[PDB]
Amino acid sequence: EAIKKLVGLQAKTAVVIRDGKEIAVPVEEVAVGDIVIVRPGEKIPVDGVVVEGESYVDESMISGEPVPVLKSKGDEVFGATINNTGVLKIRATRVGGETLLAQIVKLVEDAMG
């Protein structure tokens, strides 16, 4: 439920493109600037901006909106959201405690702490 469910929704792994090749890494190893590749059906692991591809993304777990949202080059995407329809390449813009999800968690933890 709620916040506890959100923490459980965070990605644990990512696939980054480094030195011209895909590498699967624990999500903690993703850096701002990394190019991440996300396949249809996979969780977007960090916040970022689409650099390649076009796909409907399911953001219901954060925004509560049941209808997925079209993401194309230049659009922002959020960690923990689910990529639905097409492969996306995304440049990471916020990772770790800086993601939207992490900021929500922090807001609640701080207020209730």
Curated annotation (Swiss-Prot):
Ranges of the Cytoplasmic topological domain: 1-112
Intracellular or extracellular location(s): Cell membrane
Which cysteines form disulfides? none
Which family does the entry's similarity section mention? Belongs to the cation transport ATPase (P-type) (TC 3.A.3) family. Type IB subfamily.
Q: What function is annotated for this protein? A: Probably involved in copper and silver export.
Its quaternary organisation is:
Interacts with CopZ probably in the CopZ Cu(+)-bound form.
Full protein name? Probable copper-exporting P-type ATPase
Source species, please? Archaeoglobus fulgidus (strain ATCC 49558 / DSM 4304 / JCM 9628 / NBRC 100126 / VC-16)
Underlying gene: copA
